[PDB]
Design a protein around this ligand. Structure first.
Ligand SMILES: O=c1[nH]c(=O)c2nn[nH]c2[nH]1
Ligand SMILES: O=c1[nH]c(=O)c2nn[nH]c2[nH]1
Ligand SMILES: O=c1[nH]c(=O)c2nn[nH]c2[nH]1
Ligand SMILES: O=c1[nH]c(=O)c2nn[nH]c2[nH]1
Ligand code: NA
Ligand code: NA
Ligand code: NA
Ligand code: NA
Lengths: 295, 295, 295, 295
């Protein structure tokens, strides 16, 4: 037997950082969960019990805190690139670092119409994520994403004209509820190294904001022919607005809300045009994916 | 042996209702999870296998949907009171109904600064809840609550002057992070029945809004001497603003964020006045409760 | 306003303890999650920002570890009683301690038919719990429980003869699946103090074992007329076997498995006597409770 | 823009099947959660709103139930292969099916030392999984796995001789707790189609049993030099015992249990050789992966 692939490191490292403005007294907080996995010439730790090649995962944890102390943690694309680069440069035998960051929302509170200087609220479990792969001699690959964005529209979704055979019971519809949890990922063109990532720093927050805005607007305004057709419209627009993105991937559950026939009870009308009360279904769910690139 | 207490019913009944305005085209959605448990002269189902006294839990589920079809579902205090009253009036041998409702957020989307007519976003997992106990001959007891409201302040929290003995290692502090998930419950004076609940309908949404606003403002503005002292200030204000509340209960975790000493690494300064990077702790947590009433 | 009730302390304190037998080399591990909440003359911490009355929750955490170091941690009824008693005796102004312990399973591994001296497996998320309330001058109240015991029987459950009215759609059945997650609690007679708890130490593990065995056997062997009737049989037997128990409470979900009519597809027969494939329902669920005491 | 990749289908389809032995009266239950995603010539549903190419996800759900009705559901490798093959053969334009199955434990109850004919217990949240990829003209790729197997050993784990630099604070140790949740996957050689999968049916359950046994025995008996070294020993043995496996992948968290220094309290000794009480850490955790193949 032989080691075909190996990676190891520290997961679930929770980090908070506060920035305090000297002049204004305004404080800004960042909170993330970080995972760092390393690859390189480490096979002998597995095959020969040779720990001399292991950078302890506890040390990786220390490094994350030290790096956060000495560098900005925003945008997360930059922080992940700094962190991954550190490992490949510091350790001769480590040749790849894989950094995953989940950013948690701490939104500044408005009290009496004024933004508060040091108080924050978690408005939703929506996350902003990055995956940064730093590979020695191959540059820096970054995938940025948003996840946990849960939306619902109560009309202006349709689904008809699908294949019908002996396995089909679903009725065609011209008016249904559409609800989903949005997972959207945009993959950046490969960067040559940290200097190039630094050169594009303003584009990261701007592209996240664009991706979010395009997702919300398209969802709200499309008279949707299917999840497939609506998601494609979203991806098309993001690619058009940021030339440094190579691909956009969406993964969308279709969280079903079923009509409830109440006609057995005193002829009560609650289906089709009379539908007011629905039963949300926890499972099963549709799951629709697509990756869109440039032609 | 004897049955000392018994209750039974249906839990986790998910319900969605849409209201469609005829003139404006604006749609409004409500989504809740409902539990209904009944009590009454039902001992023989347990002791003698006599099912004749059982209103099937499946029928309770049907009743929830039918009731939602025929009545407003907002405010939840009213809907719960209608639902509980139904069971005690419909069935001679049922003498108490216990209705718990969790309301999920579907907040109307703003697209290009305009509120969208039929698109919604789940902004946070904060819930608005009610517990309604309808007891034949004893009226209607309602407890209203908000839960899952997660906040953090990065300064203006202190904790010093506590008891110090041979079990104590905690250092006094004049500047710490305070973060919590707010669970706040206000208990209404007993209502004589459904007519009286109807008479107070406008107070329910107003008091929820007040409780939320008082919680947020007090948290943000108090230079907190402890969780205990800040929570008491919140409860005091709610009681002052709504005379029909008898008690206010708060239950607050203290979600710790620990300083990280980095001085072992090149004398890096990250404690006290130099603290920038902290380690959020998943567990353990402080848990502080109090119930405040009128003197 | 006035403080009507207050309690505070530390939740989610994870504790592991190992016992090493000197002669045999056999090791035994215990892992628990502990919560301790205190009450007493502490109102002024809430109303006057007087921290002098607060035993810091961090100190409560230290005390749990110290107590576990110096005392057996099994049975949990004894450990909880020691822990609660400590607080009321050590601090003049603390008059009640409320201790909740969840015990996690670490079952010794069998390797090649022999029990291993120091290796363990988590066989299921079933827990053994205690709630111990130590109240100065009122002794020690203990509630013991098991929870998270998930079972299913595929036949020998019936449900017919229930009330049928205009809200009822459920069909009577003489053969259904019954599946539940068992939550069973037995409440001990009040103990005068720690000496009395010590005197009954062997009864705690024995009664837990009995409660578990009675639950499993009754579930498996009863030709169940309803969840109500089967649960009552369980409680009756536990009360008969342990005279120091005052009440037994069961709380049982009815986790539904629905038939799937496949007759639309080539007349395939999958209902009633031909039912083989079912759809487990995540929600809603029945919820049936009862408390049984001595007549 | 162009569709680069697309797949869609139904997730979280819960399925239960019962087998009833005619002669013996013994019943056996199976419960699984199934996901099926399809690929093929479906781009136009995304780009042109052409639903004619969509097999509705609701129909995929129906197909799963029908397939379970007409075929054995065990071993899951066979059921997944039947299910995936159905889609590529039935629909001309569907060219790949991806089937994921999670099998839930329902272990027959022993009552009074005898196996019960129709009563079952969920003994642990350990799962047995398969991933089956059926690709038209490329055969059937199967990855089998076990997950959620949680173990702990209280001694006979060491970790010393790792790299030490200015980022390192971890002390070397010759005696520590090792606890993990095992995720192990074995990848089968490609099969040409369903006939070949059928020919190997007995090997599937046998190899699962072997993988489980090797994991448990190696974990219990290895005087572990690191997670890396122990996991490699496991994988080596599985590959040696089943020639039809090409690779074995392990993914293991290192769930830390920290010593608690209690010496500040009356010189209490609880570290090194005197360590009895430990603090389990919820996060962060080490994460160690490796894929082992044939040389
Ligand atoms: O938008 C949808 N896409 C689909 O593929 C599908 N299948 N069933 N319902 C559906 N809705
Ligand atoms: O606000 C606090 N209240 C308390 O009771 C406490 N105990 N430790 N830290 C604390 N902080
Ligand atoms: O055992 C049962 N008890 C009940 O109260 C009930 N109601 N619906 N189905 C049921 N099954
Ligand atoms: O077994 C281990 N492997 C590692 O890579 C490691 N790093 N810190 N502790 C560790 N333990
Ligand atoms: Na390197
Ligand atoms: Na009544
Ligand atoms: Na006392
Ligand atoms: Na095909």
């Amino acid at each position: 037997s032989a080691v075909k692939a190996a990676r190891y490191g520290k997961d679930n490292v929770r980090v908070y950082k506060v920035h305090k403005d000297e002049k204004t007294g305004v404080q800004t907080v960042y909170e993330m969960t970080v995972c760092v996995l390393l690859e390189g010439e480490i096979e002998t730790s597995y095959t020969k019990a040779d720990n001399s090649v292991i950078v302890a995962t506890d040390s990786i944890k220390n490094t994350i805190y030290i790096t956060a102390k000495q560098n900005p943690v925003t945008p997360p694309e930059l922080f992940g690139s700094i962190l991954g680069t550190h490992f490949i440069e510091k350790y001769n035998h480590i040749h790849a670092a894989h950094v995953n960051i989940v950013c948690h929302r701490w939104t500044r509170m408005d009290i009496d119409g004024k933004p508060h200087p040091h108080s924050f609220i978690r408005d939703s479990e929506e996350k902003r994520n990055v995956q940064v792969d730093v590979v020695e001699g191959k540059g820096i690959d970054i995938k940025s994403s948003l996840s946990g964005l849960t939306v619902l529209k109560s009309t202006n979704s349709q689904f008809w004209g699908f294949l019908r055979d002996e396995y089909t019971t679903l009725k065609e519809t011209w008016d249904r509820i559409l609800s989903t949890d949005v997972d959207a990922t945009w993959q950046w063109k490969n960067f040559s190294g940290l200097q190039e990532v630094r050169s594009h720093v303003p584009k990261f927050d701007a592209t996240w904001a664009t991706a979010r805005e395009v997702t919300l607007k398209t969802f709200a305004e499309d008279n949707s022919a299917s999840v497939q057709a609506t998601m494609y419209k979203m991806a098309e627009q993001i690619l058009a607005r940021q030339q440094l993105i190579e691909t956009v991937e969406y993964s969308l559950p279709n969280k079903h809300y079923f009509e409830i026939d109440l006609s057995w009870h005193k002829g009560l009308q609650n289906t089709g045009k009379n539908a007011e009360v629905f039963a949300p279904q926890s499972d099963p769910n549709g799951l629709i994916k697509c990756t869109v690139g440039r032609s």
